[PDB]
Amino acid sequence: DIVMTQSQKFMSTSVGDRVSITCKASQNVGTAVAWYQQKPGQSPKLMIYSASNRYTGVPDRFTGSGSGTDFTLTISNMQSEDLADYFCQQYSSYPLTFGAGTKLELKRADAAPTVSIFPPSSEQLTSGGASVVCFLNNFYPKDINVKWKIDGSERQNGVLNSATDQDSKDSTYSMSSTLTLTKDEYERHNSYTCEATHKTSTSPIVKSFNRNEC
Amino acid sequence: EAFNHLELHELAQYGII
Amino acid sequence: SHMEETRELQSLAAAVVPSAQTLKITDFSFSDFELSDLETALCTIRMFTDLNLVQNFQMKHEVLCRWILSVKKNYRKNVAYHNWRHAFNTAQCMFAALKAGKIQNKLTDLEILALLIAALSHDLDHRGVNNSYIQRSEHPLAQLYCHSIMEHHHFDQCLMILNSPGNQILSGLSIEEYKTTLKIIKQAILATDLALYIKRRGEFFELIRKNQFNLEDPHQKELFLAMLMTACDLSAITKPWPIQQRIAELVATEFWEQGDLERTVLQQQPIPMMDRNKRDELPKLQVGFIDFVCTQLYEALTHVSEDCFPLLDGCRKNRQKWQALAEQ
Amino acid sequence: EVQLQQSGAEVVRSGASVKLSCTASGFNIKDYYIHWVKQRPEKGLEWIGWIDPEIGDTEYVPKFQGKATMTADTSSNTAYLQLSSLTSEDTAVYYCNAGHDYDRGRFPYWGQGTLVTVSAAKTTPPSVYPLAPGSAAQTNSMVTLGCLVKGYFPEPVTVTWNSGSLSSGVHTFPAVLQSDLYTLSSSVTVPSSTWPSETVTCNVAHPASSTKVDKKIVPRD
Ligand SMILES: CC(C)Cn1c(=O)n(C)c(=O)c2nc[nH]c21
Ligand SMILES: CC(C)Cn1c(=O)n(C)c(=O)c2nc[nH]c21
C-alpha cells in the first residue's frame, strides 16, 4: 500500500492568506493525485485532480502542484468558506489510498484558559466512584497541556481529556480533563491539583482543593 | 459459422465466430 | 462542418506529396503515432502513385483526393481501434508488402489496385463491435446480411463511395476492368473476416508445407490474396514493442467497451478477452491469439516471399514479450 | 445536482450485521464504479473496495473479505454495503463515492457518510452529578458550575441549563467511553453575583432510556 502523508493535522489561517497544504507519497505516483475538501457531516468534494488540474466548478483560488512524491494544494486569497478538512489521494495503483487530512482553522488573538476544578460530589461518592473534573475554557491557541497531581505527585492513569471544536463564533477552544478513581483510592489522599500550561503565561495556571476542608 | 466442435472453445475465447 | 471538409480538400489537393523514402512508408517497422491527419492522406497518395496505379488508370489528382478524404471521414472517430488509422496502417503494411517484401512483381496491376482500395476500406463504418455481437443482439444488419455480416457492410460502403460523384477513382477503367476489379475487391474485404481466414487457411498452409504452392494457379492465387489481406489487417501485431504495446491498448479498450454492452443490454457474460475486469489476463490471451492466429500465418507468408520475414520476426518478438508479461 | 445520499447513523450490537444504503440522484450509477471508504475516529480514510453496478463485479481489499459485502441496483440507483460479525473496531463513518468506470480513481462524487457505532453494551440511563465549587474564601468574579453525566449508553444525551434560558457561557463536551459506557460534562459560567441568589439547574435527557434528570447546583459539595 502506498502511504500518503499529510504531516500537518491543523493549520491556523486568516481570510486573505495564501495557504499551502503538503502531501507526500511513499512511492512515485506521477501526477496521479487528487485533493478533496470536506466539511463536518458533509460529502467530501473533488477539488484538484492529476495533481494540478482544477475540477469543474471549483473556484480559481485553488491550485495544486507537484509530482513524483511531493504534492501541494494551494489556496490563494483564502475565504471563510475555505475553512475545512483537506485530503490527498493517489490513484496511481491499487489499493487507492488517502492522506489523513489537514484541517484549516481560524486565527484570532491568544486567550488564556479559564480553569476550574471540582471535587467528587457526595452523591457520586455514595456510589463508590470519584471523578475530579477540571475545565479549561475559552483559550487560544489550541496547544495546551494539563497535568494532575495527587498530594503533589503527577497522576498519569485514570485521566480522560475531551475537547470541543473551535468555536464558530468566538474562535476559541475549550477542554475538560477528568480524573476518575474509586472512592477508596480518592479517600486515601488530600490534595488534588489541575495544572494548565499554555503559551499565555509563564506560570502555569494551578487549581486545587483539599479533601479535608471540602 | 459451423466448425468442428473441438475447435469451438478456442474460436470463441478469441473474438471469432 | 461541410466547410472544414471542403477546405481540407483545397489544402490537400495542392500540397506536395513527399517521397516514399521521406515518409518511411517502405518500412515494416513504420508508425503513424506522430503523423497528422493530412500527412496520412499524403502517404496514401504516395502509395497509389508509387504503385503506378495513378498513371496506369488515368486518375485525376482532384478525384483521388476527394475519394481518400471521403474514406477518412467514414471511419468513426469515437471508435477505439477500428478507426481510420487502422485502415491506414493496414494499407501501409499492404504497401510495404508489395515493395520491400517484393510482391508487386508477382501480380497484375488490376490486382494491386484492388488490394490497395480494399485494404483502405476493409472496415468502413465499423461500429467497434464484432460479428459475433451484432449477430447475438439481432442488429438489423444481421437481418440484412447472412455470413460475414460486417465485412459485407464494409464493402457496401466502399462501393457506395466509389459511385459517389467526384470519387470515381476508377472512372478510367474499361467496363471489363472495372467489373473484375470490383469482384476482387469484394473478395478481399470479405477475406478480412477472421472466420473465413480460419475456415480456409488450412488448405493454404499445406500447399506451402508440401512445397506445392504456386502463384500461377488462378485459384491458388486468389486464396493467397485472401491470406494477404488477413496478414495486413492484423500487421499491428508485428510492430516494435513500444508500438505493439500501445495499439494493443486500443484493441483492449474497444473490446472492453463491447464487454460492457454484453452485460448491460445483452445480460450475458463476455468472453474474458472483452471482460474489462480481467485486464490482468491480457498478455496470455495475447499469447494464445498470436499462437493460434498469427505466427502460423506470417511463417507461411515468408515461404512465399523471403523479404516478408520482418513481419514474422516482429511477430514472434512481441509474442516473446507478452509471454514474459503473462508470467508477471 | 449530482448527489449521493447515504442512510442515517446506526447504533448496533457487536456480532450483528448492518446494511448501509447510498442513493444516487441527478445521475445514473451504471457507468461508474461505486467505492466505499471507512474513516475511524482520529484516523485517516481507508478504502474498502468497489462494485461495478453494471455487472455486479466487486473487488474487496483483504482486510474486509468476509466483513463487507457490496451490492448495487441500477434501476433504483442504489448501492449497498453489508457489514457482518461487527466488532468495536468497525465503529467508523462509512462513505460511498463514485467515479467513471474508465477512470483510474478520481472521486468527484461522495455521499455524506454514515456513522456506525458498534458495542456489546446494554442501554443504561446516566447518573448526573452536580459540580459545585468548594468554599474557598479567595474573592473572585464570574463563577463556573457544571454537571457530570456518567455511565450511559448509547449516545446521545442532551444538556441544557435553566431549561435553555442559560445558553451563552455553556460548554458541553464530546462524550468518551469508560469501559463500554459514556461520560461527558457540561460547564456553565454566570456572574458571581447571580449565583447562588438565582437558581442554576442542569437538565439532562437521554431519549434511549426515556430519562430526564434535573440537578440544581447548590453551594458546598
Ligand atoms: C456502371 C459501370 C460498369 C461503369 N463505370 C465505369 O466503367 N467506370 C470505369 C467507373 O469508374 C464507374 N463508376 C461507376 N460506374 C462506373
Ligand atoms: C479484429 C481484431 C481486433 C483482432 N485482433 C487484432 O487485430 N489485433 C491486432 C490484436 O492484437 C488482437 N488481439 C485479439 N484480437 C486481435
User: Do residue D134 and residue D100 come from a single domain?
Assistant: no
Q: How far is C239 from chain B (nearest CA, A)?
A: 20
Task: Answer yes or no: is C111 within a domain.
Answer: yes
Residues C307, C100 contacting (CB under 8 angstroms): yes
DSSP assignment letter at C295: I
Whether the bond into A95 is cis, omega within 30 of 0: yes
With both helix axes pointing from N to C terminus, report the angle between C84-99 and C218-233 in degrees, rounded to the nearest 10: 130
CA dihedral over C154, C158, C159, C164, signed as positive or negative: positive
Residue reference for cell 461518592: A125
Q: Name the closest residue on chain C to residue D55, using Cα atoms.
A: C263
- State which of C64, C67, C178 you would mutate to test the pocket of ligand 1, scoring each by most atoms of that ligand within 8 A of its C-beta: C178
Give DSSP secondary structure letters for C246-294. Answer: HHHHHHHHHHHHHHHHHHHTS-SPPPGGG-GGGGGGHHHHHHHHIIIII
Given D120, D136, D171, the domain boundary residue is D120
User: Do residue D139 and residue D106 come from a single domain?
Assistant: no
Beta strand pairing status for D18-25 and D78-83? antiparallel
**Which residues in chain C have Cβ-Cβ distances shorter than 8 Å to D54?**
260, 263-264
Given D92, D120, D148, the domain boundary residue is D120
For residue A178 the three cell numbers come to: 477528568
Calpha distance C181→C167 (Å, rounded):
16
User: Do residue D66 and residue D103 come from a single domain?
Assistant: yes
Task: Answer yes or no: is C1 within a domain.
Answer: no
User: Do residue D2 and residue D105 come from a single domain?
Assistant: yes
Partner C contacted by D67 (CB < 8 A): no
CA dihedral over C30, C34, C37, C39, signed as positive or negative: negative
User: Nearest CA to C294 among C320, C274, C272?
Assistant: C320
Task: Answer yes or no: is C158 within a domain.
Answer: yes
Complete domains list, chain A, with CATH? 1-107 (2.60.40.10), 108-211 (2.60.40.10)
User: Do residue D129 and residue D30 come from a single domain?
Assistant: no
Q: Is C170 in the pocket of ligand 1 (CB under 6 A)?
A: yes
Q: Between the CA of residue C153 and those of A98, C123, C159, C189, C234, what are the distances in Å?
A: 50, 8, 10, 10, 19
φ, ψ at A140 (rounded to 5°): -160, 135
Q: Tell me the three-class secondary structure of C18-65, residue by residue.
A: CCHHHHCCCCCCCCCCCCCHHHHHHHHHHHHHHCCHHHHCCCCHHHHH
With both helix axes pointing from N to C terminus, report the angle between C194-209 and C175-191 in degrees, rounded to the nearest 10: 100
User: Do residue D20 and residue D113 come from a single domain?
Assistant: yes
What was the structure determination method?
Answer: cryo-EM
User: Do residue D115 and residue D172 come from a single domain?
Assistant: no
What's the CA angle centered on C21, arms C18 and C26, to 5 degrees?
115
CA of C310 relative to ligand 2 center, distance in Å: 19
What's the CA angle centered on A111, arms A110 and A115, to 5 degrees?
145
Share in percent of chain C as helix, strand, coil (round to 5): 70, 0, 30
Task: Answer yes or no: is C308 within a domain.
Answer: yes
Calpha distance C215→C305 (Å, rounded):
11
User: Do residue D116 and residue D8 come from a single domain?
Assistant: yes
Task: Answer yes or no: is C67 within a domain.
Answer: yes
User: Nearest CA to A45 among C205, C39, D112?
Assistant: D112
Whether the bond into D133 is cis, omega within 30 of 0: no
CA of C38 relative to ligand 2 center, distance in Å: 26
Question: Which range marks the domain in which residue D71 is found?
Answer: 1-120
Question: How many domains is chain D partitioned into structurally?
Answer: 2
CATH of the domain at D3: 2.60.40.10
Q: How far is D83 from chain C (nearest CA, A)?
A: 24
Question: Which range marks the domain in which residue C248 is found?
Answer: 6-328
User: Do residue D94 and residue D169 come from a single domain?
Assistant: no
CATH of the domain at C216: 1.10.1300.10
Strand stretches in chain A, DSSP E: 4-5, 10-13, 19-25, 33-38, 45-49, 53-54, 62-67, 70-75, 85-90, 97-98, 102-106, 114-118, 129-139, 145-150, 153-154, 159-163, 173-182, 191-197, 205-210
Task: Answer yes or no: is C253 within a domain.
Answer: yes
Question: How many domains is chain C partitioned into structurally?
Answer: 1
Given D82, D102, D120, the domain boundary residue is D120
Residues C93, C232 contacting (CB under 8 angstroms): yes
Residues C227, C204 contacting (CB under 8 angstroms): yes
Coil, strand or helix: which one is B11?
helix
Calpha distance D192→A120 (Å, rounded):
22
User: Do residue D116 and residue D14 come from a single domain?
Assistant: yes
User: Do residue D26 and residue D80 come from a single domain?
Assistant: yes
User: Do residue D139 and residue D31 come from a single domain?
Assistant: no
